[PDB]
């Protein structure tokens, strides 16, 4: 499949943008434009063929498209940030981190498959409000999940429930043991995307960079499953927290989107007479200080640490982040 719409010019434009598939500088917004709003289906199709995953796992191209298309329809188009474009961008970004030189020959194809799928499903059906909002407003979801990783459990539930129908089941020709290991890994990684778990995750990552063992040639030695899944769960977390590491032109659009989502929640809070969460207040929160604060406290320490694990591979990402931080600081009118 070369196009999803009526415009013949787009095949070319789409195919053009997909030349950057293996690069950090891919522009998912363009992919979205040239694919009739199917950034996730298109990107995943592209990633799977690049990695020969459909052949390696005997996934019919037809079952795959129908699954992806449906996965993608389960992202809410009326949610500013947490929609299929962010899913696409996290899938693509993980695709690039998986090919980093320092992790060469390290992961099985099942593992590579799990990480890319995890990426794709990891915010599906996101309502546009935070876990704390669902908990404080007694949502059906918080009731289902008992207030623990409410959204994350949900996203996983939806992704795997979409595989039940044979016409959608992309893992049909995996072995029971393979599916078993996939589910265990995908679950681990998506749950890892819960921000509430981030310090515990960074702590444990810092404490793997300490005992790190780069083999003679250049690649990291990860022998056991426990070290391997820890990198993957951190890679997908990085991917999700990657917007500030992209070109400024992309970071700003992402930033605009998430603030729109956050202020939509503020409005819904106010509408219900709840205490308005500070970063969700359109009347008082500085968009710019939010990003400087986000980078300084969350994104830099994570990437500073990822960059360490795989150096010098991520050095260019660190330089971009540091430049992007400074751009935002410089837009704060105060010293
Ligand atoms: C565009 C730069 N960017 N990308 C993400 C993000 C962000 N929070 C994400 C929320 C979803 O989980 C991954 C992190 C924030 C941000 N996050 C928060 C804390 C917050 O309001 N949360 C709601 C639920 C989890 C954290 N405050 O600012 C700022 N810029 C971002
Ligand atoms: As495509
Ligand atoms: As289906
Ligand atoms: As908030
Ligand atoms: Mg999430
Ligand atoms: Zn996400």
PDB file of N, CA and C and ligand atoms in Angstrom, residues 81-82 130 195 240-241 243-244 251 254-255 258 262 279 291 294, ligand 1:
ATOM      1  N   UNK A  81      -2.905  15.807  22.170  1.00  0.00           N
ATOM      2  CA  UNK A  81      -1.546  15.234  22.175  1.00  0.00           C
ATOM      3  C   UNK A  81      -1.575  13.717  22.085  1.00  0.00           C
ATOM      4  N   UNK A  82      -2.396  13.119  22.917  1.00  0.00           N
ATOM      5  CA  UNK A  82      -2.417  11.699  23.123  1.00  0.00           C
ATOM      6  C   UNK A  82      -3.288  10.980  22.057  1.00  0.00           C
ATOM      7  N   UNK A 130      -5.310  12.925  32.939  1.00  0.00           N
ATOM      8  CA  UNK A 130      -4.301  12.186  33.665  1.00  0.00           C
ATOM      9  C   UNK A 130      -4.884  11.107  34.556  1.00  0.00           C
ATOM     10  N   UNK A 195       4.351   7.654  34.400  1.00  0.00           N
ATOM     11  CA  UNK A 195       5.278   8.629  34.992  1.00  0.00           C
ATOM     12  C   UNK A 195       5.459   8.396  36.475  1.00  0.00           C
ATOM     13  N   UNK A 240       8.977   7.925  24.530  1.00  0.00           N
ATOM     14  CA  UNK A 240       7.787   8.667  24.976  1.00  0.00           C
ATOM     15  C   UNK A 240       8.214  10.086  25.475  1.00  0.00           C
ATOM     16  N   UNK A 241       9.332  10.165  26.189  1.00  0.00           N
ATOM     17  CA  UNK A 241       9.938  11.427  26.594  1.00  0.00           C
ATOM     18  C   UNK A 241      11.002  11.934  25.649  1.00  0.00           C
ATOM     19  N   UNK A 243      10.132  14.108  22.774  1.00  0.00           N
ATOM     20  CA  UNK A 243       9.800  15.318  22.039  1.00  0.00           C
ATOM     21  C   UNK A 243      10.884  16.398  22.163  1.00  0.00           C
ATOM     22  N   UNK A 244      11.379  16.683  23.398  1.00  0.00           N
ATOM     23  CA  UNK A 244      12.381  17.750  23.510  1.00  0.00           C
ATOM     24  C   UNK A 244      13.724  17.438  22.865  1.00  0.00           C
ATOM     25  N   UNK A 251       9.561  20.005  18.233  1.00  0.00           N
ATOM     26  CA  UNK A 251       9.339  20.158  19.654  1.00  0.00           C
ATOM     27  C   UNK A 251       8.258  21.193  19.943  1.00  0.00           C
ATOM     28  N   UNK A 254       4.716  19.834  19.298  1.00  0.00           N
ATOM     29  CA  UNK A 254       4.369  18.864  20.288  1.00  0.00           C
ATOM     30  C   UNK A 254       3.996  19.569  21.580  1.00  0.00           C
ATOM     31  N   UNK A 255       4.873  20.467  22.012  1.00  0.00           N
ATOM     32  CA  UNK A 255       4.633  21.321  23.165  1.00  0.00           C
ATOM     33  C   UNK A 255       3.285  22.019  23.073  1.00  0.00           C
ATOM     34  N   UNK A 258       0.427  19.278  23.793  1.00  0.00           N
ATOM     35  CA  UNK A 258       0.267  18.781  25.121  1.00  0.00           C
ATOM     36  C   UNK A 258      -0.315  19.862  26.066  1.00  0.00           C
ATOM     37  N   UNK A 262      -3.556  19.513  28.400  1.00  0.00           N
ATOM     38  CA  UNK A 262      -3.472  19.940  29.799  1.00  0.00           C
ATOM     39  C   UNK A 262      -4.447  21.074  30.176  1.00  0.00           C
ATOM     40  N   UNK A 279      -0.218  22.948  36.497  1.00  0.00           N
ATOM     41  CA  UNK A 279       0.273  22.939  35.116  1.00  0.00           C
ATOM     42  C   UNK A 279      -0.872  22.834  34.095  1.00  0.00           C
ATOM     43  N   UNK A 291       8.243  23.629  29.985  1.00  0.00           N
ATOM     44  CA  UNK A 291       9.256  22.899  29.216  1.00  0.00           C
ATOM     45  C   UNK A 291      10.656  22.967  29.799  1.00  0.00           C
ATOM     46  N   UNK A 294      10.387  20.748  32.728  1.00  0.00           N
ATOM     47  CA  UNK A 294      10.294  19.344  32.281  1.00  0.00           C
ATOM     48  C   UNK A 294      11.647  18.788  31.874  1.00  0.00           C
TER      49      UNK A 294
HETATM   50  C1  LIG B   1       6.193  18.273  24.502  1.00  0.00           C
HETATM   51  C2  LIG B   1       7.141  17.940  25.640  1.00  0.00           C
HETATM   52  N1  LIG B   1       6.484  17.017  26.553  1.00  0.00           N
HETATM   53  N2  LIG B   1       6.249  15.734  26.239  1.00  0.00           N
HETATM   54  C3  LIG B   1       5.634  15.154  27.289  1.00  0.00           C
HETATM   55  C4  LIG B   1       5.446  16.130  28.359  1.00  0.00           C
HETATM   56  C5  LIG B   1       4.912  16.181  29.641  1.00  0.00           C
HETATM   57  N3  LIG B   1       4.337  15.139  30.328  1.00  0.00           N
HETATM   58  C6  LIG B   1       4.117  13.807  29.810  1.00  0.00           C
HETATM   59  C7  LIG B   1       2.708  13.421  30.254  1.00  0.00           C
HETATM   60  C8  LIG B   1       2.403  12.013  29.767  1.00  0.00           C
HETATM   61  O1  LIG B   1       3.395  11.163  30.310  1.00  0.00           O
HETATM   62  C9  LIG B   1       4.687  11.419  29.791  1.00  0.00           C
HETATM   63  C10 LIG B   1       5.147  12.793  30.265  1.00  0.00           C
HETATM   64  C11 LIG B   1       4.993  17.432  30.312  1.00  0.00           C
HETATM   65  C12 LIG B   1       4.515  17.635  31.682  1.00  0.00           C
HETATM   66  N4  LIG B   1       4.099  16.597  32.431  1.00  0.00           N
HETATM   67  C13 LIG B   1       3.762  17.113  33.616  1.00  0.00           C
HETATM   68  C14 LIG B   1       3.198  16.296  34.763  1.00  0.00           C
HETATM   69  C15 LIG B   1       1.729  16.040  34.415  1.00  0.00           C
HETATM   70  O2  LIG B   1       0.911  16.953  34.338  1.00  0.00           O
HETATM   71  N5  LIG B   1       1.441  14.733  34.174  1.00  0.00           N
HETATM   72  C16 LIG B   1       0.101  14.281  33.814  1.00  0.00           C
HETATM   73  C17 LIG B   1       0.167  12.752  33.940  1.00  0.00           C
HETATM   74  C18 LIG B   1       1.662  12.376  33.977  1.00  0.00           C
HETATM   75  C19 LIG B   1       2.437  13.670  34.264  1.00  0.00           C
HETATM   76  N6  LIG B   1       3.942  18.439  33.661  1.00  0.00           N
HETATM   77  O3  LIG B   1       4.451  18.786  32.393  1.00  0.00           O
HETATM   78  C20 LIG B   1       5.592  18.520  29.665  1.00  0.00           C
HETATM   79  N7  LIG B   1       6.088  18.460  28.436  1.00  0.00           N
HETATM   80  C21 LIG B   1       6.033  17.282  27.780  1.00  0.00           C
END
